[PDB]
From Swiss-Prot, chain A:
CDD domains: S4. It comes from the Bacteria. Keywords: Antibiotic resistance, Repressor, Ribonucleoprotein, Ribosomal protein, Ribosome biogenesis, RNA-binding, rRNA-binding, Transcription, Transcription antitermination, Transcription regulation, Transcription termination, Translation regulation. This is Small ribosomal subunit protein uS4. One of its GO terms (molecular function) is structural constituent of ribosome.
Curated annotation (Swiss-Prot), chain B:
With uS4 and uS12 plays an important role in translational accuracy. Many suppressors of streptomycin-dependent mutants of protein uS12 are found in this protein, some but not all of which decrease translational accuracy (ram, ribosomal ambiguity mutations). Located at the back of the 30S subunit body where it stabilizes the conformation of the head with respect to the body. It comes from the Bacteria. Signal peptide: none annotated. This is Small ribosomal subunit protein uS5. It comes from Escherichia coli (strain K12). One of its GO terms (cellular component) is cytosolic small ribosomal subunit. InterPro entries: Ribosomal_Su5_D2-typ_SF, Ribosomal_uS5, Ribosomal_uS5_bac-type, Ribosomal_uS5_C, Ribosomal_uS5_N, Ribosomal_uS5_N_CS, Ribsml_uS5_D2-typ_fold_subgr. PROSITE patterns: RIBOSOMAL_S5 (PS00585), S5_DSRBD (PS50881).
Curated annotation (Swiss-Prot), chain C:
The keyword Ribosomal protein applies. Belongs to the universal ribosomal protein uS8 family. One of the primary rRNA binding proteins, it binds directly to 16S rRNA central domain where it helps coordinate assembly of the platform of the 30S subunit. One of its GO terms (molecular function) is rRNA binding. This is Small ribosomal subunit protein uS8. PROSITE patterns: RIBOSOMAL_S8. The keyword RNA-binding applies. It comes from Escherichia coli (strain K12). Part of the 30S ribosomal subunit. Contacts proteins S5 and S12. Keywords: Repressor, Ribonucleoprotein, Ribosomal protein, RNA-binding, rRNA-binding, Translation regulation. GO terms for cellular component: cytoplasm; cytosol; cytosolic small ribosomal subunit. GO terms for biological process: cytoplasmic translation; regulation of mRNA stability; regulation of translation; ribosomal small subunit assembly. It comes from the Bacteria.
Swiss-Prot record, chain D:
This is Small ribosomal subunit protein uS12. Disulfide bonds: none annotated. GO terms for biological process: cytoplasmic translation; Group I intron splicing; maintenance of translational fidelity; positive regulation of RNA splicing; response to antibiotic; RNA folding; translation. The keyword RNA-binding applies. GO terms for molecular function: misfolded RNA binding; rRNA binding; structural constituent of ribosome; tRNA binding. The lineage of its organism: Bacteria, Pseudomonadati, Pseudomonadota, Gammaproteobacteria, Enterobacterales. The gene is rpsL.
Length: 205, 150, 129, 123
RNA sequence: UAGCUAGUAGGUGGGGUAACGGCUCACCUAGGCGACGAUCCCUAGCUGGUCUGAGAGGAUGACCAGCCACACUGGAACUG
RNA sequence: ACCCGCAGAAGAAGCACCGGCUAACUCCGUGCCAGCAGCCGCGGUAAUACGGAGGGUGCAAGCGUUAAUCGGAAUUACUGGGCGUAAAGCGCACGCAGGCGGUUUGUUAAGUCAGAUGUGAAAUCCCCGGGCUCAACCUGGGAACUGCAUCUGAUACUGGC
RNA sequence: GUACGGCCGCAAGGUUAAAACUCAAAUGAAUUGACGGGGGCCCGCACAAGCGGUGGAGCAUGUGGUUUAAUUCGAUGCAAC
RNA sequence: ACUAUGGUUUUUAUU
C-alpha cells in the first residue's frame, strides 16, 4: 500500500518535513511545519510513554515509503558481516532503487521515483527492474527506458535535483538518463531526521 | 564527571484515615566514579525530592569491581534477593539492549555491548543488586601471569 | 555413608578459602595427590605435603598473594553416578578461557590443554579459574 | 525428581484446553435445534438472554447464544454454532453464526460490519 | 491390568519350501515369559519432513521422496 | 512469450481500532435501559467502555472473529523445578529384589577416548556455480546428519574375576 | 476422600482415589488502622448520689400520621422538632 | 451478667 491520502497532515503531526509532495510550492516557506503552538499548554497532556521510539519508527518508514514487514527484514539483514544496525540499516534504505532514482533526480519525490520503477520504466545493468527495494551495489548502472526519457515530471525533477545536496557516492548523465554507483553511502555523510538513542532497539520495545 | 543514573520512579502512596495520600519512590545509581558502583533508594512526597534523596544515599556506598577492559571478560551469572541475572558479551554499536535495572549498572561502568536476561524475580530493587553481584563474579587477567612462575 | 573420596575434597577448599585459611587438609588418596600435582604445576596452589603412619593426610597451601584469593573458581563437574565425558574438540574452555579443566584419560590425570595437545578426550574431574 | 526416579519414569504430562473434542476440533458446526428458551445472568441484572439447545451426532449436547439485533428462531430451523462462552450467562459455551442458514442478518454499518453478516442495498 | 500360558517351553520322527524355522503334523517331555511391566485392552501410515522460539524444548507427520500394507465384505492361492 | 499500435483517469479500497494497561478522542443521544467487556469493570444528565458523528490510530487485497496447537512458559523445569509452613518427607523398626560402595596388583574389554574402511537414498537447510529482477521452483557442485557396523590403538576409570 | 472396582477387617473401619462442573482464586510472611463482653495509667460529668424536673390537667409553639383544594420542600441518632 | 441479627456497590495523581 501507498496510503494514497492527503500528505502534509502527516509531516505537520510529526513536526518534521517528510519530503512528501515536495518541490515548487513546498520550497521556501508555506509548509507551516512547527508553527501552530496551540491555545493552552503543549497538547501533551498525557500522550504515550512509548511515543518515542514509536513515532520515530513511523517517521523512518514513511520518509522512505517502506512498509513494516520489509523494514523489520532490513533490521535483520543489516546485522550480517558486522554491518551494525546503527550504520548499515540507514545505508540499505538510502541504497534502494526508489531512493537512487530520487537521488539521481528522475523523481521529485520518493513516491514519484517509485512510480517510475513499478511502471516498468527503469533498468539496472541494462536489465528492466520493477522492484523499488532493489539494492544498488558499488558497480551498478541505473537508467530510464526510451518510452519515458522525455516525460515532463522527469525533466522537472532534475531541475530540483541540482538544488538538493549532492550524493557523492554515485555518477549520472541527464541527457541519456544513465548513472553508476561508485561507493556504498556512509554514516559520516548519510544523516537523517531521527534522534541518536532511538531505532537502535527496534522491535520488541 | 561523576557517573549517575535514574532507574525508575513509582507511586508508593500512604494509607491514612479517610483514604490515601500520594508519595513517590525512586531507584538510582551513583557510587564513586566509573566501575565503582553505588545504589540509592529514596521515598518522598514529590518525584524530584525522591530522586535527589536517593542520589545522596548512592554517594555513601560503592563497590570497586573487576572491569579492566570496560566489557564483559566472560559470560557471568549473578544473584540477589530472588532476582537472577545472566550477562554475555556482544558487539558494540547497538548492543544495549537489556532491561533498565540491569542496564543502569552497566552504564555507570561504561559497558555498551551486551546481551542479558533476568530470571526468577523481576522486582527492580533486586535486579539491580543481582547485576552488582554478577559484577562481583566478573574477572580480570589472564591469570597465567599470576598463578604460574617465574 | 561415604561413597566418593572426591565428594569431600573440594568443599574443604571452597569453605576454607571462605574462612580465609592459608592451608587446607584432607585424607589422602591416589587421585587426591594426582590432582594436587597438576594444581601445583599450573600454579593454583603453592605446595602440598602428605604424612601419616595411621592414616595418611594431605595438606595443601592456598594462594592469597597480598590479600585477595588467587583461585576465582573452584568446581567439580562430573560425578560417579552421572559422569561427564568429552571428545578431542568437545573439551571445555572454562570461564570462557580464563580458567582450565582437569581430565583423567588413559594416559593419567592431565589438563584439558594436555589432552587436546595429545589429540584425545576422556572423563572430567575438576573445573578451576 | 532424582536421576534414578526420572530414569524409572518421567514427570506426568498436562493438557490445557485441547482435552475434549466436543465440536470435532473445529471453530464451528451445524445444529438443527431442539429447544428455545431464556437464561438469567450472574448478579441481578436486566440482561436476560435467549439461547438455542443443540444436539450433535457425536453424542454431545450444548447451548448456543443467538445475538444479532433480533430473534426469528424456532425448533428444527437449522443454524450454525461456533465456539464462544458467555462469562455472565451460566452454561452457555457457544455462539450463533448469522452468515448462513435461517438465522437472519443485521442492519448495515460503517463500523463493526465484519460482525454477524451484512447485505448490500440496491441504493 | 500382577501374574500369564498348552505349539505356551524343550526333545524324537515324518512331510514341506528354491531355501530357513516347529514351518506343518503326529508323539514324548514341563518348561517358557513378569516389575527393564509379561498377560490383556484403547488409540495408530512411518520417516524424509512441517510449524513454533534465540535455541533447548514443545505440538505434529496431508501434499512431498522412499518404504510397508489395502482393492465393495471375505476365503483360496494360481499364472508369470 | 515478446514486439507495435488503438485507448482514456478512465474500470480499481477495504476492515479493525481511539476509559487505565494502550498508539488515537471529542461532541451528541440513551439515563442502569438499550447496547458492551482481555482484566480493572461500563450505562441514572459531561459514558472518553453502547449507537452515531466529526477528527485521529493501525494494517492493506486484504483486514478481522473464533474451538485449538508453538511462543510469552524456567508456571513441567533435561539445558532448568519443588518437599519446616505456602504444595509434596512414609508415625516407627528390620530388610529381600533394585540403586550406591575404601584400596594394592594383574586380567577381561561391556562402557569411554583415539584412528580407519563401509554406510548414513534423492529432494532440502548451509556454503556456492547456473537459470527468471529478488525469491518460490528446476538444479550443478560442496557440507552436515556427532549415528551404526567392521578392523585397530590408548590402558585410565567403572562393572566383572 | 465425593464415585467405581480390587485388596484387608467381626464391625466402626484400613488402602488406591478420580472425572465433569466452577473461580481468579487458595496460601506463607511482615506492615498500619479499627474494633473487644481485652490489658495498664488515666481523663470526661458520662456512671454513681445530694437535689430539681419533663413525663399527669388546661393552654401555646414546632415535628410525624390522618385528610383536602393547597394543607410546602428540605433538616430530622450523637448533631433536629 | 442487657446484646442476637445487619441485603447490593463504595474516594483523590498522572504523561
Amino acid at each position: 500500500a501507498r496510503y494514497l491520502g492527503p500528505k502534509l497532515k502527516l509531516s505537520r503531526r510529526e513536526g518534521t518535513d517528510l519530503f512528501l509532495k515536495s518541490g515548487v510550492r513546498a520550497i521556501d516557506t508555506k509548509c507551516k511545519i512547527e508553527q501552530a503552538p496551540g491555545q493552552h499548554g503543549a497538547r501533551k497532556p498525557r500522550l504515550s510513554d512509548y511515543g518515542v521510539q514509536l513515532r520515530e519508527k513511523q517517521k523512518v518508514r514513511r520518509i522512505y515509503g517502506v512498509l513494516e514487514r520489509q523494514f523489520r527484514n532490513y533490521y535483520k539483514e543489516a546485522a550480517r558481516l558486522k554491518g551494525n544496525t546503527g550504520e548499515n540499516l540507514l545505508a540499505l534504505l538510502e541504497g534502494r532503487l526508489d531512493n537512487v532514482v530520487y537521488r539521481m533526480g528522475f523523481g521529485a519525490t520518493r513516491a514519484e521515483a517509485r512510480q517510475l520503477v513499478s511502471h516498468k520504466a527503469i533498468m539496472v545493468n541494462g536489465r528492466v527492474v520493477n522492484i523499488a527495494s532493489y539494492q544498488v551495489s558499488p558497480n551498478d548502472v541505473v537508467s530510464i527506458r526510451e518510452k519515458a526519457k522525455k516525460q515532463s515530471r522527469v525533466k522537472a525533477a532534475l531541475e530540483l535535483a541540482e538544488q538538493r545536496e549532492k550524493p557523492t557516492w554515485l555518477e549520472v548523465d541527464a541527457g541519456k538518463m544513465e548513472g553508476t554507483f561508485k561507493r556504498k553511502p556512509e554514516r559520516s555523510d548519510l544523516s537523517a531526521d531521527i534522534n541518536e538513542h532511538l531505532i537502535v532497539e527496534l522491535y520488541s520495545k | 564527571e561523576l557517573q549517575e543514573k535514574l532507574i525508575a520512579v513509582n507511586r508508593v502512596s500512604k494509607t491514612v484515615k479517610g483514604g490515601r495520600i500520594f508519595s513517590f519512590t525512586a531507584l538510582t545509581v551513583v557510587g564513586d566514579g566509573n566501575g565503582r558502583v553505588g545504589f540509592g533508594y529514596g521515598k518522598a512526597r514529590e518525584v524530584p525530592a525522591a530522586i535527589q534523596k536517593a542520589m545522596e544515599k548512592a554517594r555513601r556506598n560503592m563497590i570497586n569491581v573487576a572491569l579492566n577492559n570496560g566489557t564483559l571478560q566472560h559470560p557471568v551469572k549473578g544473584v540477589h534477593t530472588g532476582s537472577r541475572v545472566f550477562m554475555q558479551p556482544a558487539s558494540e554499536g547497538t548492543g544495549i539492549i537489556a532491561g533498565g535495572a540491569m542496564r543502569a549498572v552497566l552504564e555507570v561502568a561504561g559497558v555498551h555491548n551486551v546481551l542479558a536476561k533476568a530470571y526468577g524475580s523481576t522486582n527492580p530493587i533486586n535486579v539491580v543488586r543481582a547485576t552488582i553481584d554478577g559484577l562481583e563474579n566478573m574477572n580480570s587477567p589472564e591469570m597465567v601471569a599470576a598463578k604460574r612462575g617465574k | 555413608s561415604m561413597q566418593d573420596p572426591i565428594a569431600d575434597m573440594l568443599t574443604r577448599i571452597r569453605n576454607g578459602q571462605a574462612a580465609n585459611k592459608a592451608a587446607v587438609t584432607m585424607p589422602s588418596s591416589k587421585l587426591k595427590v594426582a590432582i594436587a600435582n597438576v594444581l601445583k604445576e599450573e600454579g593454583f596452589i603453592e605446595d602440598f605435603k602428605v604424612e601419616g603412619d595411621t592414616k595418611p593426610e594431605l595438606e595443601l597451601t592456598l594462594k592469597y598473594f597480598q590479600g585477595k584469593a588467587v583461585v576465582e573458581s573452584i568446581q567439580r563437574v562430573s560425578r560417579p553416578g552421572l559422569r561427564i565425558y568429552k571428545r578431542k574438540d568437545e573439551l571445555p574452555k572454562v570461564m570462557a578461557g580464563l580458567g582450565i579443566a582437569v581430565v583423567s584419560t588413559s594416559k593419567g590425570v592431565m589438563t584439558d590443554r594436555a589432552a587436546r595437545q595429545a589429540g584425545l578426550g576422556g572423563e572430567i574431574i575438576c573445573y578451576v579459574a | 525428581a532424582t536421576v534414578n526416579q526420572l530414569v524409572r519414569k518421567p514427570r506426568a504430562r498436562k493438557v490445557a484446553k485441547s482435552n475434549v473434542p466436543a465440536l470435532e476440533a473445529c471453530p464451528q458446526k451445524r445444529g438443527v435445534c431442539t429447544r428455545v428458551y431464556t437464561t438469567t445472568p450472574k448478579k441481578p441484572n436486566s440482561a436476560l438472554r435467549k439461547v438455542c439447545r443443540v444436539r450433535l451426532t457425536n453424542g454431545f449436547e450444548v447451548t448456543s447464544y443467538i445475538g444479532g439485533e433480533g430473534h426469528n428462531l424456532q425448533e428444527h430451523s437449522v443454524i450454525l454454532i461456533r465456539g464462544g462462552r458467555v462469562k455472565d450467562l451460566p452454561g452457555v459455551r457457544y455462539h450463533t453464526v448469522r452468515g448462513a442458514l435461517d438465522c437472519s442478518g443485521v442492519k448495515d454499518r460503517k463500523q463493526a460490519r465484519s460482525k454477524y453478516g451484512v447485505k448490500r442495498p440496491k441504493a
